[PDB]
């Protein structure tokens, strides 16, 4: 695995270049949204983002070295976490709002149209606000997102994955040392960033239950891909 031979700068550049595009929602200006319309836009968006996520994952150093089944397990476990931290990252410079797409910027009032979305909305806003107050950098973001990919399913199958995880940790520290942080500030920030991942996991878990709940209602048409990703959690 040539992932371990990379330097810290090489690791950063590899991840930055792997970044998936920012997709758009529909341009229909019909407001306000209904519950069906809101869910439709959100699920359609995620479905298209999933395709780019897979090509992003394959470009994450060390991921290609895994067997197909292992790659599948990791993405099935982490796909919603990855969508969420992406959403949270995009929403940083929009306090009080969530940027699902450049033409889909929502506040918490617009989350009440669908039952049980305000709970997750508030959690997502809280995470975004936390990233903003921490002044999260893009280089740190892509490290965190890759960590989610490799870590979230690693205990439900590993030494190779743990070694790649270690190198991303080394990269994160390298970035902080580069930004002028002291040794003490380096491990403190490292800890703060990783603890937020526990909350992202929590949000994903709450999110997955609601998606399943709407799978049992047969109202919003979920794509077969989305259904298969969802089914892996049941």
């Amino acid at each position: 695995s040539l992932a371990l031979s990379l330097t810290a700068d090489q690791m950063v550049s590899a991840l930055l270049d792997a970044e998936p595009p920012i997709l758009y929602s529909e341009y229909d200006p019909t407001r306000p949204f209904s519950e069906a319309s809101m869910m439709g836009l959100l699920t359609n968006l995620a479905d298209r983002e999933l395709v780019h996520m897979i090509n992003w994952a394959k470009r994450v150093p060390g991921f290609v070295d895994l067997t197909l089944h292992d790659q599948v397990h990791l993405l099935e476990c982490a796909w919603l976490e990855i969508l969420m931290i992406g959403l949270v990252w995009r929403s940083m410079e929009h306090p009080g709002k969530l940027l699902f797409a450049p033409n889909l910027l929502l506040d918490r009032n617009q989350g009440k149209c669908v039952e049980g979305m305000v709970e997750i909305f508030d959690m997502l806003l809280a995470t975004s606000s936390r990233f903003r107050m921490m002044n999260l950098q893009g280089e740190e973001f892509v490290c965190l997102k890759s960590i989610i990919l490799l870590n979230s399913g690693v205990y439900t199958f590993k030494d190779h994955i743990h070694r790649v995880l270690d190198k991303i940790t080394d990269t994160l520290i390298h970035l902080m040392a580069k930004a002028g942080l002291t040794l003490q500030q380096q491990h403190q920030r490292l800890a703060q960033l990783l603890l937020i991942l526990s909350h992202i996991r929590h949000m994903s878990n709450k999110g997955m239950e609601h998606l399943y709940s709407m799978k049992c209602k047969n109202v919003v048409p979920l794509s077969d891909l989305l259904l298969e990703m969802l089914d892996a959690h049941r």
Binding site: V51, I54, L68, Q71, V72, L75, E76, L225, E228, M229
Partner: peptide, 10 residues
């Protein structure tokens, strides 16, 4: 089998 299989293999 799995759409995810196809997307990963392209």
């Amino acid at each position: 089998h799995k759409i995810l299989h196809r997307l990963l293999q392209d």
